Design a protein around this motif. Structure first.
Motif, PDB file in Angstrom:
ATOM      1  N   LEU A 187       6.054  95.985  -0.941  1.00 49.27           N
ATOM      2  CA  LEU A 187       6.634  96.126  -2.270  1.00 49.27           C
ATOM      3  C   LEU A 187       7.852  95.371  -2.355  1.00 49.27           C
ATOM      4  O   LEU A 187       8.996  95.633  -1.771  1.00 49.27           O
TER       5      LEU A 187
ATOM      6  N   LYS B 184      10.520  99.377 -13.411  1.00 47.44           N
ATOM      7  CA  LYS B 184       9.440 100.244 -14.218  1.00 47.44           C
ATOM      8  C   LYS B 184       8.281 100.045 -13.564  1.00 47.44           C
ATOM      9  O   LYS B 184       7.181 100.805 -13.080  1.00 47.44           O
TER      10      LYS B 184
ATOM     11  N   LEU C 141      14.673 107.690  -4.425  1.00 44.49           N
ATOM     12  CA  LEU C 141      14.044 107.644  -5.663  1.00 44.49           C
ATOM     13  C   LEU C 141      13.145 108.961  -5.878  1.00 44.49           C
ATOM     14  O   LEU C 141      12.676 109.274  -4.945  1.00 44.49           O
TER      15      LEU C 141
HETATM   16  C1  LIG Z   1      14.937 100.634 -16.708  1.00 45.70           C
HETATM   17  O1  LIG Z   1      13.714 101.148 -16.070  1.00 45.70           O
HETATM   18  C2  LIG Z   1      14.271 101.806 -14.742  1.00 45.70           C
HETATM   19  C3  LIG Z   1      15.641 101.714 -14.301  1.00 45.70           C
HETATM   20  C4  LIG Z   1      15.606 102.177 -12.873  1.00 45.70           C
HETATM   21  C5  LIG Z   1      14.682 103.093 -12.353  1.00 45.70           C
HETATM   22  C6  LIG Z   1      14.786 103.710 -11.354  1.00 45.70           C
HETATM   23  C7  LIG Z   1      14.044 105.087 -11.113  1.00 45.70           C
HETATM   24  C8  LIG Z   1      14.795 106.110 -11.816  1.00 45.70           C
HETATM   25  C9  LIG Z   1      13.919 107.288 -11.694  1.00 45.70           C
HETATM   26  O2  LIG Z   1      14.390 108.500 -12.512  1.00 45.70           O
HETATM   27  C10 LIG Z   1      14.001 108.299 -13.769  1.00 45.70           C
HETATM   28  C11 LIG Z   1      12.600 107.448 -10.976  1.00 45.70           C
HETATM   29  O3  LIG Z   1      12.076 108.483 -11.047  1.00 45.70           O
HETATM   30  C12 LIG Z   1      10.582 108.291 -11.047  1.00 45.70           C
HETATM   31  C13 LIG Z   1      12.298 106.319 -10.441  1.00 45.70           C
HETATM   32  C14 LIG Z   1      12.756 105.089 -10.433  1.00 45.70           C
HETATM   33  C15 LIG Z   1      12.373 103.798  -9.859  1.00 45.70           C
HETATM   34  N1  LIG Z   1      13.310 102.776  -9.420  1.00 45.70           N
HETATM   35  N2  LIG Z   1      14.685 103.055  -9.839  1.00 45.70           N
HETATM   36  C16 LIG Z   1      15.618 102.456  -9.104  1.00 45.70           C
HETATM   37  O4  LIG Z   1      16.659 102.603  -9.509  1.00 45.70           O
HETATM   38  C17 LIG Z   1      15.365 101.465  -7.695  1.00 45.70           C
HETATM   39  C18 LIG Z   1      15.543 100.254  -8.089  1.00 45.70           C
HETATM   40  C19 LIG Z   1      15.999  99.451  -6.753  1.00 45.70           C
HETATM   41  C20 LIG Z   1      14.671  98.902  -6.158  1.00 45.70           C
HETATM   42  C21 LIG Z   1      14.781  98.002  -4.912  1.00 45.70           C
HETATM   43  C22 LIG Z   1      13.591  97.365  -4.254  1.00 45.70           C
HETATM   44  C23 LIG Z   1      12.624  96.638  -4.754  1.00 45.70           C
HETATM   45  C24 LIG Z   1      12.846  96.215  -6.224  1.00 45.70           C
HETATM   46  N3  LIG Z   1      11.998  95.410  -6.967  1.00 45.70           N
HETATM   47  C25 LIG Z   1      10.890  95.374  -6.441  1.00 45.70           C
HETATM   48  N4  LIG Z   1       9.634  94.543  -7.013  1.00 45.70           N
HETATM   49  N5  LIG Z   1      10.569  95.679  -4.983  1.00 45.70           N
HETATM   50  C26 LIG Z   1      11.417  96.537  -4.487  1.00 45.70           C
HETATM   51  N6  LIG Z   1      10.986  97.013  -3.196  1.00 45.70           N
HETATM   52  C27 LIG Z   1      16.123  97.756  -4.595  1.00 45.70           C
HETATM   53  C28 LIG Z   1      17.381  97.966  -5.254  1.00 45.70           C
HETATM   54  O5  LIG Z   1      18.623  97.724  -4.480  1.00 45.70           O
HETATM   55  C29 LIG Z   1      18.507  96.930  -3.561  1.00 45.70           C
HETATM   56  C30 LIG Z   1      17.126  98.612  -6.258  1.00 45.70           C
HETATM   57  O6  LIG Z   1      18.342  99.346  -6.911  1.00 45.70           O
HETATM   58  C31 LIG Z   1      18.599  98.278  -8.087  1.00 45.70           C
HETATM   59  C32 LIG Z   1      13.346 103.008 -12.992  1.00 45.70           C
HETATM   60  C33 LIG Z   1      13.163 102.404 -14.121  1.00 45.70           C
END
Ligand SMILES: COc1ccc([C@H]2c3cc(OC)c(OC)cc3CNN2C(=O)CCc2cc(Cc3cnc(N)nc3N)cc(OC)c2OC)cc1
Ligand SMILES: NC(=O)c1ccc[n+]([C@@H]2O[C@H](COP(=O)([O-])OP(=O)(O)OC[C@H]3O[C@@H](n4cnc5c(N)ncnc54)[C@H](OP(=O)(O)O)[C@@H]3O)[C@@H](O)[C@H]2O)c1
Length: 162
Positions: free
Chosen positions: A5, A29, A54
């Motif tokens: 991913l 998302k 997460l």
């Molecule tokens: C605005 O909508 C949002 C904003 C934040 C989130 C929140 C969130 C908050 C939650 O609780 C409510 C929750 O609970 C279910 C789940 C989630 C899910 N992820 N979340 C994150 O913070 C992680 C974001 C993130 C990823 C990745 C890896 C990644 C990146 N991208 C791809 N394609 N592959 C990937 N391997 C790297 C990061 O840094 C290096 C990172 O940090 C910015 C979710 C939705």
């Protein structure tokens, strides 16, 4: 089932200074929808970038540090440990883990960030000669999501005699 991913840009940049180079809510998302209820495996630096586990999924961190013990995180110390994790496992990053696992995974969920960013960490090169495009979907843009992006689901092609 073992999957990659990742989001990478047109030059396969995935990170800069231990952060995502882009601000793109829609993709987070996307990550949330794909990985919820499943398992994330990530390297130590990727974990510290996020800072916390997460919610609503198993967080697994790979590190050589025997002192690593964070609330809400399972720790492994070798690649071999990944294969004994049950359920759908997502290789979550970063560059080192992608490099170690791209030849091992069944499929990849790739968000192509359709731009050119400054990076210091990259996704390994790959060719569509080796991967079937199971799906390709343009991400919808708005005032909060301004960078064009494409969601790919790629499945490894079988090698056959021709
Ligand atoms: C605005 O909508 C949002 C904003 C934040 C989130 C929140 C969130 C908050 C939650 O609780 C409510 C929750 O609970 C279910 C789940 C989630 C899910 N992820 N979340 C994150 O913070 C992680 C974001 C993130 C990823 C990745 C890896 C990644 C990146 N991208 C791809 N394609 N592959 C990937 N391997 C790297 C990061 O840094 C290096 C990172 O940090 C910015 C979710 C939705
Ligand atoms: N989709 C995306 O765009 C995406 C996704 C995730 C991350 N990222 C980005 O990727 C960048 C980080 O990548 P990175 O390669 O520098 O770090 P990383 O892969 O997240 O972490 C590297 C660390 O993982 C541990 N590790 C890796 N392989 C191991 C093995 N076989 N055995 C034991 N430990 C192992 C080691 O930790 P110890 O040194 O503690 O042993 C190693 O230093 C960040 O900029 C982040 O923003 C981007």
């Amino acid at each position: 089932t073992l999957s990659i991913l990742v989001a990478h840009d047109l030059q396969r940049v995935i990170g800069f200074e231990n952060q995502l180079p882009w601000h793109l809510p829609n993709d987070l998302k996307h990550v949330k929808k794909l990985s919820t209820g499943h398992t994330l495996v990530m390297g130590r630096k990727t974990f510290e970038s996020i800072g916390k586990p997460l919610p609503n999924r198993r967080n697994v961190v790979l590190t050589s540090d025997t002192s690593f013990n964070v609330e809400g995180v399972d720790v492994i110390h070798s690649i071999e440990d990944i294969y004994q994790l049950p359920g759908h496992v997502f290789i979550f990053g970063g560059q080192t883990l992608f490099e170690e696992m791209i030849d091992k995974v069944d499929d990849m969920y790739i968000t192509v960030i359709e731009g050119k960013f400054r990076g210091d960490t990259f996704f390994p090169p790959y060719t569509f000669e080796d991967w079937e495009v199971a799906s390709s979907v343009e991400g919808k843009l708005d005032e909060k999501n301004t960078i064009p992006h494409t969601f790919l689901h790629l499945i490894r092609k079988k090698l056959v005699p021709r």
